[PDB]
Design a protein around this ligand. Structure first.
Ligand SMILES: Brc1ccnc2ncccc12
Ligand SMILES: Brc1ccnc2ncccc12
Length: 129
């Protein structure tokens, strides 16, 4: 892509520790599956392309970018060590949107809908076994 967009977040790194857990399996099979097909998911399914969107300040304001495409790849490629790392990525994604954008903007309403669903699903994150 454009040299003015940063590299996406890491999704493969032999140096980083990782494992499967039943919680991470739930995060893929239930949480990301349910969010991905939400009617408002599409803006969040890939990194923000600040060039195409004419947001030249985006990556000056958002220094820890995250999106559900990256999360999906991290889950499918078994990048994570624990559920907390993945939950953190979701929460970064939502809060980036709320930091960059005005309350009540469409993109914020979209994020808020996804976040509502996310919290309902994480309340049922299974006991680690
Ligand atoms: Br598309 C998109 C996704 C996430 N955040 C965004 N913020 C502003 C404009 C477009 C955005
Ligand atoms: Br793509 C895009 C660009 C700017 N604003 C947006 N708001 C909502 C959803 C997608 C957006």
């Amino acid at each position: 892509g454009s040299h003015m967009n940063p590299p996406p977040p890491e999704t493969s790194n032999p140096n980083k520790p990782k494992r499967q857990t039943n919680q991470l399996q739930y995060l893929l099979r239930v949480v990301l599956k349910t969010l991905w097909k939400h009617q408002f998911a599409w803006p969040f399914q890939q990194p923000v392309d600040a060039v195409k969107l004419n947001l030249p300040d985006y990556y000056k304001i958002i220094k820890t970018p995250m999106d559900m495409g990256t999360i999906k790849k991290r889950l499918e490629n078994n990048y994570y060590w624990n559920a907390q790392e993945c939950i953190q990525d979701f929460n970064t994604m939502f809060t980036n949107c709320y930091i960059y954008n005005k309350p009540g903007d469409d993109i914020v309403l979209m994020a808020e809908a996804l976040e509502k669903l996310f919290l309902q699903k994480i309340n049922e994150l299974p006991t680690e076994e």
